[PDB]
Structure formats: C-alpha cells, structure tokens
Amino acid sequence: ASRILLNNGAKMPILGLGTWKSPPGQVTEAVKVAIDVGYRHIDCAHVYQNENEVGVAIQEKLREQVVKREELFIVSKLWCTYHEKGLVKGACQKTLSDLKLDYLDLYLIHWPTGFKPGKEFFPLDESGNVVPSDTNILDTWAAMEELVDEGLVKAIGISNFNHLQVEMILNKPGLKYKPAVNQIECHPYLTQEKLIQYCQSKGIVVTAYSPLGSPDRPWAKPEDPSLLEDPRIKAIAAKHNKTTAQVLIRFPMQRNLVVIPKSVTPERIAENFKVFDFELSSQDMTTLLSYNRNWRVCALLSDTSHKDYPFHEEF
Ligand SMILES: NC(=O)c1ccc[n+]([C@@H]2O[C@H](COP(=O)([O-])OP(=O)(O)OC[C@H]3O[C@@H](n4cnc5c(N)ncnc54)[C@H](OP(=O)(O)O)[C@@H]3O)[C@@H](O)[C@H]2O)c1
Ligand SMILES: O=C(O)COc1cc(Cl)ccc1C(=O)NCc1cccc([N+](=O)[O-])c1
C-alpha cells in the first residue's frame, strides 16, 4: 500500500519529499515537479527557511487543478526556540501562514531539546554552547495537543526522541493524544532496530529521514561514510536495474516505515518516486541491515549537555 494508517484515522503516504537544504530559489520548482510526478507528502520545517516557497508551489498546483488539499499530506515541525507553551501556537500559525494552509496533516516536535527563545535558531553562549530553555517535554506536548483541539493540525508527533522520551509522553497522566509518528534518522549505517521495534510496538508510525545519508549536510567531512557511493549497495541496485538511491528508499518502505528523500533536481525527484515497481529480496534486506554502524549524520555536539539531548541513551 502507498499509505499507512495513523492513530487519528488518517492515512499517510509512505513516500514524501524532503525539503531541508532545498534553497528557496529552487524549492518551488522542486515541489511543483514532485506533485506532477505523484508525490502527495511533503516534509517541511520552519527552521528550513523555505516554507513560503513550498507554500507557493502547493498553491499553484491546487489552482492548476492537479491536486486538491485533501490529497496532500503536509508535515511541519515546531523549532527548539518555541517550546515554551505560550509560543507554540504562534509558531504553528507562522508555519501555516507561510505554507498558505489552514491546517497541517502532521505537526512534530522537531527535537526534544528546548533552546533559549529569541530570533536565533541556535542561540549560543560566548564559548559555543547552545543555550537551553527551561522547558520540558511534557508541557511542550500539552501545547501541541491544544493545536489539534483547535483544528490547526490533524495529528501531532515527535522527532529525534529516544524511547525513554517517547515513554515520558505515553505515560503522562491525562494524556489527550498519543504521538502518531516519531521521525528519526534511519538508513543502512543507522538501522535503528530497537527504536523502531519500540515505536511500532506502541502503535507509533516511524518516518526515516536522511535515507540517502544526507550527503549535502553542511557539517560533512570527506572521510565520512557515504551511502550513495557504497559499492556494496551499488551492487544490489545493479542486480535490480535500479539506482542506489532507489534501493535506499525502497529499503525502509519494506520495514513498514515512511521515508522522505530530499532532492531539488527534477530528474532525481522523479527517479526517487519510481520505487513501487520492484521488491528487495529477503537477502537484500538482511544484507542492508547488516551494514549498520550506529553512525549518525544528524546530531549537535554543542548541545550534548542538554538535559533532553536524545542520543546518550542506547535507543
Ligand atoms: N526531523 C529532523 O530532525 C530531520 C533531520 C534531517 C532530515 N529531515 C528531513 O529528511 C529529509 C531527507 O533527509 P536529508 O535532506 O538529510 O538527506 P537525504 O534525503 O538523505 O539526501 C539528500 C541529498 O541526496 C541527493 N540526492 C537526492 N536524490 C538523489 C538521487 N536519486 N541520486 C543521487 N543523489 C540524490 C540530494 O541532492 P539534490 O537535492 O541536489 O538533488 C541531496 O544532496 C530532509 O530534507 C528533511 O525533510 C528531518
Ligand atoms: O534538524 C533538522 O531537521 C536537520 O538538521 C539541521 C537543519 C538546519 Cl536548517 C539547521 C541545523 C540542523 C542541525 O544542526 N540539526 C541537528 C540538531 C539540532 C537541534 C538539536 C539536536 N540535538 O541533537 O539535540 C540536533
């Protein structure tokens, strides 16, 4: 199936378009092309600084009669500097205004860590440490629940939460909505078997981000492992007459994950969608899982001391 059922009764497309590092000058066209070739899910965030341009694309294709709103599944995320309960609605409405939408299908707490409120996305002190805010996960979650109650968003979820942090929410007395989704890094070098097992056992859908290894991440080092260039994965792709990326997107699909590869290149956007016409075998799957190195492309050492930093726990 093309979509997976969430706890709110809504269906989420298992393939979506990522937008981190899609420049505003190019993401409008990316999203238009993606909608043309069949994408219905777009992964957004305020911190990506391109939601206006994403919203221009969606507006235009609605106006062209290519899709209607109900067919789209638009996700955004509350940034770390807005975790205070008084700031959450404002942040959500800014995102809605930028995207020119009147609801989000899914709104996530982008990271469990709250940062000092202000204009800077990464507020630092004079020695480079990220400055935290005195906010906590449960209070932030209650503020997210209010967004559902007011119809701003149809579902809420989390991102980059370890299983203890997910448990905190599940075990909150008076909880009103369980998280629908946990969006985490996931690829053959970081296969997340225990966190996926946990999440799926609790009825939480998992979305895999950076499925191609985020080669464009701004802190990459030349010597870092490179998924798209891994000759072992290229070999699996050649035997299916598919590209490495296609293999890398199909892999989490077969683990009952949602997956959100990013591109601004029209040919790659189309290429990446062409993943429902082949199957990785059992051996392929076993092989790809065996490449795990517990290697993360997305972390922040300047915030390692945060009380809620998620990656000290095993999972
Ligand atoms: N929740 C969070 O904390 C979080 C964190 C990271 C990412 N995410 C979401 O996950 C999405 C995907 O992750 P990501 O952006 O880190 O990286 P990714 O999707 O793993 O990889 C994106 C990179 O791969 C290139 N690429 C795309 N398709 C390709 C293909 N068929 N062949 C060769 N290269 C290809 C892209 O280049 P071009 O674009 O130049 O074509 C870009 O450089 C993000 O955009 C964001 O929406 C969420
Ligand atoms: O967050 C994302 O979606 C992708 O990562 C981005 C994106 C942009 Cl626009 C800017 C900066 C980052 C980045 O340093 N993210 C890592 C990060 C941030 C905060 C906390 C953590 N943390 O580990 O607590 C990690």
From Swiss-Prot:
Any one annotated GO CC term: nucleoplasm
Organs and tissues of expression: Highly expressed in embryonic epithelial cells (EUE) in response to osmotic stress.
Recorded hits in PROSITE patterns, A to Z, give: ALDOKETO_REDUCTASE_1 (PS00798), ALDOKETO_REDUCTASE_2 (PS00062), ALDOKETO_REDUCTASE_3 (PS00063)
Which residues does the annotation say bind substrate?
Answer: 110
SUPFAM superfamilies (alphabetical)? NAD(P)-linked oxidoreductase (SSF51430)
Q: Which gene encodes it?
A: AKR1B1
Question: Which residues are annotated as active site?
Answer: 48
Quaternary structure and partners: Monomer.
Q: How is activity regulated here? A: Cys-298 may regulate the kinetic and inhibition properties of the enzyme, but does not participate in catalysis. Tolrestat inhibits retinal reduction.
| Gene Ontology BP annotations | C21-steroid hormone biosynthetic process; carbohydrate metabolic process; cellular hyperosmotic salinity response; daunorubicin metabolic process; doxorubicin metabolic process; epithelial cell maturation; fructose biosynthetic process; metanephric collecting duct development
Record keyword NADP present: yes
Positions bearing the site annotation: Lowers pKa of active site Tyr:
77
**According to the UniProt entry, which residues carry N6-acetyllysine?**
94, 221, 262
Name this protein carries in UniProt: Aldo-keto reductase family 1 member B1
The consequence of residue 48 to F is: Complete loss of glyceraldehyde oxidoreductase activity
Subcellular location as annotated: Cytoplasm
Keywords, ordered alphabetically: Acetylation, Cytoplasm, Lipid metabolism, NADP, Oxidoreductase, Phosphoprotein
Residues recorded as binding NADP(+), renumbered to this chain, are: 9-18, 210-272
The record's function comment reads:
Catalyzes the NADPH-dependent reduction of a wide variety of carbonyl-containing compounds to their corresponding alcohols. Displays enzymatic activity towards endogenous metabolites such as aromatic and aliphatic aldehydes, ketones, monosacharides, bile acids and xenobiotics substrates. Key enzyme in the polyol pathway, catalyzes reduction of glucose to sorbitol during hyperglycemia. Reduces steroids and their derivatives and prostaglandins. Displays low enzymatic activity toward all-trans-retinal, 9-cis-retinal, and 13-cis-retinal.
Under the GO molecular function aspect, what terms does this record hold? aldose reductase (NADPH) activity; all-trans-retinol dehydrogenase (NADP+) activity; allyl-alcohol dehydrogenase activity; electron transfer activity; glyceraldehyde oxidoreductase activity; glycerol dehydrogenase (NADP+) activity; L-glucuronate reductase activity; prostaglandin H2 endoperoxidase reductase activity
Under Enzyme Commission nomenclature, its number is 1.1.1.21, 1.1.1.300, 1.1.1.372, 1.1.1.54
Instruction: Give the family this protein belongs to, as stated in its UniProt record.
Output: Belongs to the aldo/keto reductase family.
Q: For this protein, what reaction is catalysed?
A: an alditol + NADP(+) = an aldose + NADPH + H(+); all-trans-retinol + NADP(+) = all-trans-retinal + NADPH + H(+); 9-cis-retinol + NADP(+) = 9-cis-retinal + NADPH + H(+); 13-cis-retinol + NADP(+) = 13-cis-retinal + NADPH + H(+)
Phosphoserine carried by residues? 2
Outcome of altering residue 43 to N? Reduced glyceraldehyde oxidoreductase activity
Main localisation, per the record? cytoplasm
Q: Which Pfam families match?
A: Aldo_ket_red
